[PDB]
Design a protein around this nucleic acid. Structure first.
Length: 49
DNA sequence: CTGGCCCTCGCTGTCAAAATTGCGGCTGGGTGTGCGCCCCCACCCCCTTTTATAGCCCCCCTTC
C-alpha cells in the first residue's frame, strides 16, 4: 500500500504494476466490471412482440 | 301423405396457445475441477477396585 518505489524494487515487485488484481493459486485473476440494468428506477419499454 | 317452422344436437373451421428444433467455418492458447431425519439392533467402552511409578496440573491455602 504505502511502499515507495525503492521498497517495491527491493521486494521484487514492479513499481509500474498498477495492481488491481487478485492472486489465486498463483494466477493473477482480474474481475471485469459487469453491466446490469439500473435498479430502483421505473423503465417503460416497447415490447411489440 | 305432404309442406312450413324452430329445436337439440353433430360436426366443422378457425383461432389460439403450448411445445419444438436450430442458431458459420477453421485455429491457437491458458486454467480450472471432480443426501438427510429419526429410529432400532449389535458390539464395545467405561463404570469400579487394587498397586507401583512420575510429570503435570487443579484447587485451596497462605503470604504480604
Amino acid at each position: 500500500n504505502g511502499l515507495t518505489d525503492r521498497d517495491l524494487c527491493e521486494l521484487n515487485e514492479c513499481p509500474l504494476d498498477p495492481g488491481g488484481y487478485f492472486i489465486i493459486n498463483g494466477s493473477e485473476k482480474v474481475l471485469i466490471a459487469q453491466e446490469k440494468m439500473a435498479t430502483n428506477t421505473v423503465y417503460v419499454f416497447a415490447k411489440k412482440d
